[PDB]
């Protein structure tokens, strides 16, 4: 153990069958899929807010990868230095780039 587990300053969870379905019941504006990470909250001082994301979207891809759950997003943040998550807004797809930070307690 020396340098591992990056830091982006954001909370994400694995959209389980329960939650994934709970969203469709509440906000009837999400696709018919059940794979991807859900954004919980973002700290006012992190690459997340600086990159151009929000705590009301859903991750799916990253730097040319397919994410399904939070566990998948984590390894990516610590595996890839450059993160390129695509977020769909309105009726067009957009590419978001966020660079994590290094930190060790």
């Amino acid at each position: 153990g020396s340098h591992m587990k990056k830091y982006i300053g954001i909370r994400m969870m694995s959209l389980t069958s329960s939650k994934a379905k709970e969203l469709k019941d509440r906000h009837r504006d999400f696709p018919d899929v059940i794979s991807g990470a859900y954004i919980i909250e973002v700290i006012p001082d992190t690459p997340a807010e600086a990159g151009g994301l929000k705590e009301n979207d859903v991750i799916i891809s990253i730097n040319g990868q397919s994410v399904v759950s939070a566990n998948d997003v984590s390894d990516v943040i610590k595996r890839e230095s450059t993160l390129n998550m695509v977020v769909r807004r309105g009726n067009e797809d957009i590419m978001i780039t966020v660079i994590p930070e290094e930190i060790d307690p």
Partner: peptide, 7 residues
């Protein structure tokens, strides 16, 4: 479940 990942 929740399962929050503060990454």
């Amino acid at each position: 479940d929740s399962r929050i990942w503060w990454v």
